[PDB]
Symmetry: D3
Subunit: 320 residues, 6 copies
């Protein structure tokens, strides 16, 4: 349904960002750095036997305390590599045993809970906090605070996510040379923002990323969650320029252009949640060394368990 693959490979649409994109993010991170990280780990009583699980609490946007899990595989090596895992839309940190893959492959896993979500497919424990008034919005998180980038929901999520990497680095068994940031869909868009904003991330795993090339996305598909934006615009006919102006500060295509760390991307060519031209726009602008795995017959599931193995191989080669 989207551009054919040879056009996708060369798709580099003109980028739109405001003159103060960097300043906005510098100011944001500076203000939140004024609050101590105060990363706290508490070993959980758990039935898990191959992994130690810890409850995590750390300061994200404006000192707000974000939950996480830290999963440490019970192995002989002193320092371990670490994957910081961001969660898809309407998910949350769930139970420790929901996140066994990376530890089973020998990596400490830091799972960041997602402020205010945690109610669609996997439970969460972290609340959101708005700046002040909660403006008229369409149901969901995509239009929460959308009339100003200072009030926009993903400002708070992305800052949480940058601080999560510092929180992971605070665990002494983490090898700070081998901290990976990872996610799919919303998780992928979060990780992409982190890949540009974090000083500590060493590699990026970015699967079927959401939060990319918003203007084209709402023109291309009527699926959720991009359709929250479209539905808002159907009602607020006077706010089109403001909406896209705000979203430009959160668009993965704009972060991709600033990111320098090694990355592995994936894309499903039949994905109508995260359309491939949106994924390719981010991938093609990504400034660091990069590869993409292309799944021509998959929808939003992308490469699934095949991709998981591709990721393990990729990291092993990068870090060897």
């Amino acid at each position: 349904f989207d551009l054919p693959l040879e056009e996708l490979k060369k798709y580099r649409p003109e980028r739109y960002e405001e003159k103060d994109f960097d300043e906005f993010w510098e100011e944001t991170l500076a203000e939140s750095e004024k609050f101590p990280l105060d990363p706290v780990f508490e070993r959980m009583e758990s039935h898990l036997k191959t992994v130690e699980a810890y409850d995590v609490t750390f300061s994200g946007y404006r000192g707000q305390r974000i939950k996480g899990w830290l999963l440490v595989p019970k192995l002989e090596e002193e320092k371990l590599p670490c994957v910081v895992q961001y969660i898809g839309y309407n998910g949350g940190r769930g139970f420790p045993h929901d996140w066994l893959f990376w530890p089973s492959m020998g990596y400490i896993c830091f799972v960041m809970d997602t402020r205010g979500q945690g109610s669609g497919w996997l439970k969460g424990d972290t609340p959101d906090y708005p700046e002040g008034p909660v403006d008229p919005q369409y149901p969901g998180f995509m239009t929460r605070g959308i009339l100003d980038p200072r009030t926009y929901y993903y400002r708070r999520v992305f800052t949480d996510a940058v601080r999560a990497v510092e929180a992971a680095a605070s665990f002494p068994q983490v090898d700070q040379e081998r901290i990976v940031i990872a996610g799919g869909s919303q998780g992928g868009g979060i990780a992409l923002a982190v890949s540009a904003l974090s000083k500590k991330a060493k590699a990026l795993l970015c699967d079927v990323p959401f939060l990319c090339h918003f203007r084209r996305a709402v023109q291309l598909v009527d699926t959720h969650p991009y359709a929250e934006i479209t539905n808002f615009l159907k009602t607020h006919r006077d706010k089109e320029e403001i909406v896209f102006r705000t979203l430009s500060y959160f668009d993965g295509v704009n972060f991709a252009a600033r990111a320098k760390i090694p990355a592995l991307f994936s894309v499903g060519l039949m994905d109508n949640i995260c359309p491939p031209s949106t994924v390719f726009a981010a991938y093609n602008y990504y400034a660091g060394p990069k590869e993409i795995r292309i799944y021509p017959y998959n929808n939003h599931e992308g490469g699934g368990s095949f991709q998981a193995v591709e990721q393990v191989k990729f990291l092993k080669k990068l870090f060897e």
Copy 2:
């Protein structure tokens, strides 16, 4: 799809409420009465010629400044009857010309904007404000703060709605003894809550009401917006009792049992958004003088323009 009509007419299921229902609402309304109402009626340069439109501002929940419209028909009479109109889900106050029916029929119409909504089918101008943290929730308003009646979104809306009647009553041309409260679906549910809580309303028009008999609604239909609650429960599997206990404080059936003013209801027997058993449970417990118009072949549109005529006729006979 629901109970047959002769069973609907006798459907009076056992009500569930906590022992402190009245105290919860007494304390809520008392706390908000501590801020001055400070009703503002600012004439709006509209192009309307048979109606004068005012931009309304008034203090609702905890002093928070709620928007609205006041439309005054251009008539001889010094004291006119008034309809206070509440709005369907995802709507808001829109334009003054969206609410011409009651003014055209000789009634001043006070349209209350809906905090935080106004983004699905008609725009709105009024923000929400959470108590404190914004808990994990499913997209929308149904599960916003659902873990405690003190934090629940409809606490705020219903309080606004009570205060709206006091605001309308402040308008010098409003006849204090002919103030009607009206709404369809969400609007119906809000009006029902107000019919129990306000002491200033003379009559209720309650069309295809939402926010009624939650426990049963989520068993009967998988439509939105009831499905928000179901979807929250699908994830937060431990929270059934808490969710239903919170919702008991906001259930139209429990307000209906308290309401003493004359009411005209309407119901569509094929409505799968507000299922007939939910509307009938409310109607059957409604403690004031009452009638219901039954539309057996209509879905959620109910009686539409026919029902509007029934309303005008009902109010005319009542006020004689």
Copy 3:
């Protein structure tokens, strides 16, 4: 889904019409003009207080008696501007209170009932009369009489609509310098025909118009009502040429080319009932002074209440 906007703005495709288009309409109108118009305005008992309502009857196609409403706002004006309102597919004149907008804005409103429809979303009271046998057709109006323009349903509707403006001009309070023809969807298609054929209309309001560019419409979308045509062709496989020949006499694109009066159009770029390339073919051929309001994120709702405000402003400027 249709042509991108830069292409829609330049889209002026080869028109298809028979050499005898004008003759066909000259003869149609002359033939119906032999019967006296005989417009009848019966003041009605009404609950309405700001408006006087009349039950209308007038002679349309071949003297057949068409129903309407006349809504006159109660203002201190010896003459008032007038909107002649045409109605969407499957609608009818409903109740007087269904048409309050234009009276509220200070316009006498003549609502034309639609022959034979009035059964889908708002009731009507006027029958159709065929031009002899009622040929095999697909359910609906789009294919009724389609094998010959002389028998086609829209020949009668459009005649009626032209005659409606003459009937409005016959009410003494109407300001014949300020007669507007308006409609959305089917309404807009009717209004486009009237804009070419009427000697009385002074401005056109044409929203999301239907009955435009039929040949392209059926190639682009499978929605109703355009799909009635496609479904008829799926069965009458021998009638492609005849069907498109008939429809060319009723196509808004060919009327647009003949229209001289000022117009305000609207279009939704996500409209899949009236595709944007069909609306733009009509608009780009429209030969009078014109403007278009473009709603990029809206579907068939177009600009809704925002567009209603644009219309009032447009007409005040035009007529000032």
Copy 4:
């Protein structure tokens, strides 16, 4: 989805008809008998080799001229049994080769074309003619003239169908002792009316019959074509009694109670077009010697080709 089979077999609901049902039909048929039948059989040039095909014209309702086919198998017998075949909704007489079953089984087949349809799945050639004005209606045939039994579409169809049997009987090779009336769905409904009204039919084949038990059909399913009725009622909310009064004169259940000839019925227990309770109401009231083939897993296809073999066996046995 409907009553279980054990209850369907005992399902004999309270009937509803007007006291003048028989008078209405007697007057109807007497008036149309005043026009000469003048059955015209024109032998066609055909590629068919086992069958002789004739183009039929005969006088139906009020002398109106109805098309048909007559298919005569090339056999030694001088007199042959005859099946008069009525056609499903939106179909028409199509081509001679569409109707080969019965002639291949050694039956002359008279295929009656259906006035005004013929545009959905098989073409037709016969126009409808209204009783003057064609009232406001929902698209299709179900609500055409529904406000008065004298104007209702199926008054003209059922009269045509009775006259079709008279026309078939007129062909010299037909054995008037072995005239069968047959149809499925709309065809079955028509054939049921004809089993009560024709003095010439000798056996009925009635598959998955439509036009039965209208009041219950519209409560049970939202499929077309019954939904044409529900949709008209959703708009004409003041016409519920009148609509069902009109429909009582055309209801297969009411004809079944009057029919004397032997019949074979079929029913699909998962048929949501003609729900099983509607079909059983008709079968249970049928007053001639009868049998029903019950297909528990089939939808509206019923028994398909299996039922065709049942019919052949049933007729062989009956005709001795």
Copy 5:
């Protein structure tokens, strides 16, 4: 939704087939020819009066016994033309009275039952016979797809070639007027037969399935082509193997080889058999040919209108 008609009429995509396409089919057919055909025509007791019905059995793939019907119109001419009819997906031979058209128009009709199907819209009586039946998506499109030797349509298409030999064995059949016909799956089968059989005299190919698989699975998500897509969604490592297998069964590759006169039909709104897949086959078809294009029809194609076009085409051809 597909290429516009002007483009479809000259759509001639580069073909993909293995070097051994012909050898594969030659070996396949020679191995099945080592088993005797043994056509069996059992005259049936029937309620049909204008035709004589026979219960057919013959040997298709590797001597496996395939069911069918033979319908013989009762006519004074001793040698009659014959149509060998293939059946659409999820159908089977049904009852003899399901197939009255061609006999009513004076043609003997040999109806080939379809191995292992017969359970969606019309019943069938003939089993499939595979060794191991590999992991597959529900249905027939992916059965044995990892090797052309094990692929389901190897067996169907062999059956279908053998069916023409079985029809020709019937003594009233005029061997100079044997037609092969079908729609959708039937048309894809008939298209393979048009290349592989030395006995067919003409081809009726409506709305053909089993054509241009690579494009088909990119263009539509309908069944049955979506069985292949779904298999590929799970077996991510088998993309090249899957399309290599399918190339041996692709109508476009058969059409390039076929020589007999043919009448095609296509629906421009068909989303089961997309018009570009039909036109790729039609444009490569190497025999004298015509196509009836129905711009507004979906997969129903020309329906009863096309049936008339078929009878006329054959009349003119055989006269």
Copy 6:
């Protein structure tokens, strides 16, 4: 959409089985046990670090070689408890890393691949082996349905009995602490195994499929039960035969025979495995039993919540 919970709890519909149910299964198992089990566990090179992964092969129905995974958590304890895991419809054994839950909780996990499937949501490696494959609707539900001896699930349930024997043969498995587990199709398989094998100590049965077929096909039109209804729509003469065959594979009939402690789960909004079908099996289950009821869940059931319940249930059992 199904019976209200109060009635589901009381739903004990009359069971239907043939008088030779036990004899059929005795003969089936005895016939397959005449072939050597021959379990092979080949240690693999893997990226996993906390677990040892083995490629498994063993002899299921009639000596047919079935694939599997064996995942061993790297722990001090020498003889570990073991969960034998059966897979959902259209899945297969996938990758070793697809099954980390039980090993991470301290259980060796034996994952049985499902013959012939492995192509819808997770890949598989094991073929089916039928002679003739009768007319069927696409999928596995109607494959060989005209005779219980030829029916697809005769082969799967035998494989699944055999899997337990194969798990028991691995040296690190505590042969006295083996659990059987599955969801949906996996739950139906495990329910059969709870009746047919005496090796297992407990049953984990989530959202079970293959239960109360006669009712299932009347209540829902979803797949995979609809495969049965669709076959019946066409094979109108085979209704009695179809339901006779299915009675030999109905979880309600196996439940009545099972004795081991069981933990069930049900979603009251599940329209794939309707609550009445699940309660009919649960209500007849003869052993010590409990059911976790998820009133707002569809076919996902309890998801990770239910997994926690499972770990607690097994901990209590094995203390």
